[PDB]
Design an enzyme around this catalytic site. Structure first.
Site, PDB file in Angstrom:
ATOM      1  N   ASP A 193       3.142  -1.362  -8.996  1.00 14.14           N
ATOM      2  CA  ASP A 193       4.215  -0.865  -8.147  1.00 14.14           C
ATOM      3  C   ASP A 193       4.681  -2.011  -7.266  1.00 14.14           C
ATOM      4  O   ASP A 193       4.188  -3.139  -7.362  1.00 14.14           O
ATOM      5  CB  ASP A 193       3.750   0.358  -7.338  1.00 14.14           C
ATOM      6  CG  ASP A 193       2.816   0.000  -6.195  1.00 14.14           C
ATOM      7  OD1 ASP A 193       2.467  -1.204  -6.049  1.00 14.14           O
ATOM      8  OD2 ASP A 193       2.430   0.937  -5.456  1.00 14.14           O
ATOM      9  N   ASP A 195       5.190  -2.538  -3.069  1.00  7.55           N
ATOM     10  CA  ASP A 195       4.849  -1.967  -1.780  1.00  7.55           C
ATOM     11  C   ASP A 195       5.624  -2.672  -0.667  1.00  7.55           C
ATOM     12  O   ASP A 195       5.552  -3.894  -0.522  1.00  7.55           O
ATOM     13  CB  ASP A 195       3.338  -2.073  -1.485  1.00  7.55           C
ATOM     14  CG  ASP A 195       2.496  -1.533  -2.593  1.00  7.55           C
ATOM     15  OD1 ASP A 195       2.378  -0.287  -2.658  1.00  7.55           O
ATOM     16  OD2 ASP A 195       1.969  -2.336  -3.394  1.00  7.55           O
ATOM     17  N   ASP A 251       6.490   2.013  -3.055  1.00  8.49           N
ATOM     18  CA  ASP A 251       5.910   2.637  -1.884  1.00  8.49           C
ATOM     19  C   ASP A 251       6.589   2.064  -0.650  1.00  8.49           C
ATOM     20  O   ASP A 251       6.632   0.851  -0.462  1.00  8.49           O
ATOM     21  CB  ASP A 251       4.394   2.420  -1.822  1.00  8.49           C
ATOM     22  CG  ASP A 251       3.656   3.228  -2.870  1.00  8.49           C
ATOM     23  OD1 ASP A 251       4.137   4.332  -3.228  1.00  8.49           O
ATOM     24  OD2 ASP A 251       2.594   2.780  -3.327  1.00  8.49           O
TER      25      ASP A 251
HETATM   26  O1  2KH Z   1      -7.308   3.522  -1.911  1.00  8.30           O
HETATM   27  C1  2KH Z   1      -6.520   2.681  -1.470  1.00  8.30           C
HETATM   28  C2  2KH Z   1      -5.324   2.239  -2.121  1.00  8.30           C
HETATM   29  C3  2KH Z   1      -4.569   1.305  -1.531  1.00  8.30           C
HETATM   30  N1  2KH Z   1      -4.893   0.756  -0.306  1.00  8.30           N
HETATM   31  C4  2KH Z   1      -4.070  -0.284   0.340  1.00  8.30           C
HETATM   32  O2  2KH Z   1      -2.742  -0.202  -0.115  1.00  8.30           O
HETATM   33  C5  2KH Z   1      -2.377  -1.437  -0.789  1.00  8.30           C
HETATM   34  C6  2KH Z   1      -1.396  -1.156  -1.893  1.00  8.30           C
HETATM   35  O3  2KH Z   1      -1.944  -0.134  -2.722  1.00  8.30           O
HETATM   36  P1  2KH Z   1      -1.621  -0.250  -4.286  1.00  8.30           P
HETATM   37  O4  2KH Z   1      -2.158   1.006  -4.934  1.00  8.30           O
HETATM   38  O5  2KH Z   1      -0.132  -0.455  -4.428  1.00  8.30           O
HETATM   39  N2  2KH Z   1      -2.482  -1.543  -4.925  1.00  8.30           N
HETATM   40  P2  2KH Z   1      -2.027  -3.149  -5.019  1.00  8.30           P
HETATM   41  O6  2KH Z   1      -3.083  -3.984  -4.303  1.00  8.30           O
HETATM   42  O7  2KH Z   1      -0.611  -3.333  -4.531  1.00  8.30           O
HETATM   43  O8  2KH Z   1      -2.051  -3.564  -6.563  1.00  8.30           O
HETATM   44  P3  2KH Z   1      -1.160  -2.862  -7.716  1.00  8.30           P
HETATM   45  O9  2KH Z   1      -2.066  -1.946  -8.514  1.00  8.30           O
HETATM   46  O10 2KH Z   1      -0.618  -4.011  -8.515  1.00  8.30           O
HETATM   47  O11 2KH Z   1      -0.106  -2.013  -7.044  1.00  8.30           O
HETATM   48  C7  2KH Z   1      -3.709  -1.970  -1.267  1.00  8.30           C
HETATM   49  O12 2KH Z   1      -3.621  -3.340  -1.602  1.00  8.30           O
HETATM   50  C8  2KH Z   1      -4.584  -1.675  -0.054  1.00  8.30           C
HETATM   51  O13 2KH Z   1      -4.217  -2.557   0.989  1.00  8.30           O
HETATM   52  C9  2KH Z   1      -6.029   1.118   0.376  1.00  8.30           C
HETATM   53  O14 2KH Z   1      -6.323   0.624   1.455  1.00  8.30           O
HETATM   54  N3  2KH Z   1      -6.784   2.080  -0.247  1.00  8.30           N
HETATM   55 MG    MG Z   2       1.366   1.137  -3.751  1.00  8.65          MG
HETATM   56 MG    MG Z   3       0.909  -2.156  -5.165  1.00  2.13          MG
END
Ligand code: 2KH
Ligand code: MG
Ligand code: MG
Ligand code: CL
Ligand code: CL
Ligand code: NA
Length: 327
Positions: A193, A195, A251
DNA sequence: CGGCATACG
DNA sequence: CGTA
DNA sequence: GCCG
């Protein structure tokens, strides 16, 4: 090697990729079974290997590393000796793992929902489409868009989405800013995604902002799905492509500027990095950390932070740029 | 043995 | 329950 | 599953 992931740099790419991937399979499977503690140990062990400065080549190099006990050490030992770990391969080909993975990858489906469907006998996405009465609107969106959402978002896609979000934000509230967070801020070249974190430099002006933003994006025809006062929205956006378009998860988070360093930290990740940072804060420092602030429960006071640097200093940790938070 | 992050939609 |  |  310190015991908490927030105490050491973890680069995005490293020297123990295969070993960390195998441990993360066991971590994922542990979660599918509800064993949050074992998921955490396997994730932490994997993360330790990411932080190492060179490849593990012999078992003795694990001695004294935190989070390597009998189980994780045996996994590594088998990979080093045979190139494969039987426990890992057995998980990978199990019907339970493959279906829980398939189901939990759907937007709107978590472990508990996937598990119930698994126990009801369901195994494929078409099984779910055939019985659509049992799906939430959110799961219907996730299933309709599942193929596009399974396609990695490219760093090349991110610039285009940030500009259209900025346009809607600038109309909703002049002066509001859009900051890229999540995995791309840690340097990832691809993601599940995009963010974003939205604020305004005048405290309080961000109140009520996100509905105004969502309404404008929806009026421009860019929103394929969203949940609708609120401050987080989990969207599916229409992203142009040559001759067509694709659905992408986006997001949006709004925070007041006073909380922006905490929200930036909390949304920049990694997920394991934040869990470890919060655990470190509470258990080692007696302070309670979240995406809004850092609370001293003895003084009953919140730490004012003007930067992520401030927050690391408050916690007595060496500063780690986002690119070294890939725990 | 207890603990395992934290909050919003 | 889902989500980050 | 591992730590303290
Ligand atoms: O369970 C969770 C999920 C997300 N988060 C926080 O939200 C951020 C974005 O959550 P995200 O689900 O978009 N993960 P991301 O690191 O961007 O990798 P991708 O799979 O490529 O999207 C994460 O990097 C954490 O900082 C949490 O703190 N807890
Ligand atoms: Mg996200
Ligand atoms: Mg993400
Ligand atoms: Cl939070
Ligand atoms: Cl937040
Ligand atoms: Na899901």
């Amino acid at each position: 090697m310190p015991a908490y992931a927030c105490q050491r740099p973890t680069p995005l790419t490293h020297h123990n990729t295969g070993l960390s991937e195998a441990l993360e399979i066991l971590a994922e499977a542990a979660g599918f079974e509800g064993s949050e503690g074992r998921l955490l140990t396997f994730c932490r062990a994997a993360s330790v290997l990411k932080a190492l400065p060179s490849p593990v080549t012999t078992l003795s190099q694990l001695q004294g590393l935190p989070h390597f006990g009998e189980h994780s050490s045996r996994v590594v030992q088998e990979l080093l000796e045979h190139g494969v770990c039987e426990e890992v391969e057995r998980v990978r080909r199990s019907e339970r793992y493959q279906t829980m993975k398939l189901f939990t990858q759907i937007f709107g489906v978590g472990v508990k929902t996937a598990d119930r469907w698994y126990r009801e006998g369901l195994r494929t996405l078409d099984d779910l489409r055939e019985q659509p009465q049992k799906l939430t609107q959110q799961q219907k969106a996730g299933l309709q868009h599942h193929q596009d959402l399974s396609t990695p978002v490219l760093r090349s896609d991110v610039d285009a989405l940030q500009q259209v979000v900025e346009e809607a934000v600038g109309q909703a509230l002049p002066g509001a800013t859009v900051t890229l967070t999540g995995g791309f801020r840690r340097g990832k070249l691809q993601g599940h995604d995009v963010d974003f974190l939205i604020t305004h430099p005048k405290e309080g002006q961000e109140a009520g902002l996100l509905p105004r933003v969502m309404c404008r994006l929806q009026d421009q025809g860019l929103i394929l799905y969203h949940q609708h006062a609120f401050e987080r929205s989990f969207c599916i956006f229409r992203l142009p492509q040559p001759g067509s378009w694709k659905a992408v998860r986006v997001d949006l988070v709004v925070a007041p500027v006073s909380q922006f360093p905490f929200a930036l930290l909390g949304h920049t990740g990694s997920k394991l990095f934040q869990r470890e940072l919060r655990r470190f804060s509470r258990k080692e420092k007696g302070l309670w950390l979240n995406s809004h602030g850092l609370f001293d429960p003895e003084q009953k006071t919140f730490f004012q932070a003007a930067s992520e640097e401030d927050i690391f200093r408050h916690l007595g940790l060496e500063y780690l740029p986002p690119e070294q938070r890939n725990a």
